[PDB]
């Protein structure tokens, strides 16, 4: 379970976990311990998202997709988008 060297975990005001990287002076939602193998989005399967991505079903705005690596949000499922565009 332990973090890499010069990493701390912390809680937001709400008690949400995030990670502090003192090596690069940055914070992230992504757990460095859980760093999965990445893959081209078009190589994912059904209901599969690539590493870094999170599907948000927002009661106000509806479903959208969050990429924690690029710090981007978008509406299209990124796997379906890559598959679409590769046609």
């Amino acid at each position: 379970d332990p973090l890499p060297d010069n990493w701390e975990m912390a809680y937001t005001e709400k008690g949400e976990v995030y990670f502090i990287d003192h090596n690069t002076k940055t914070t992230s939602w992504l757990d460095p311990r859980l760093a999965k193998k990445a893959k081209p989005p078009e190589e994912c399967k059904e209901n599969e998202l690539p590493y870094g991505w999170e599907k948000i079903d927002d009661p106000i705005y509806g479903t959208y997709y969050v990429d924690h690596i690029n710090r981007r949000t978008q509406f299209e499922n990124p796997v379906l988008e890559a598959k679409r565009k590769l046609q």
């Binding site: 912390a10 914070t27 992230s28």
Partner: peptide, 20 residues
Amino acid sequence: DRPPPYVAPPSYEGPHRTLG
């Protein structure tokens, strides 16, 4: 439209609840 903007964790340069 654009979806909701990316919500980052608290910025590094500041106080953190390091209570782990």
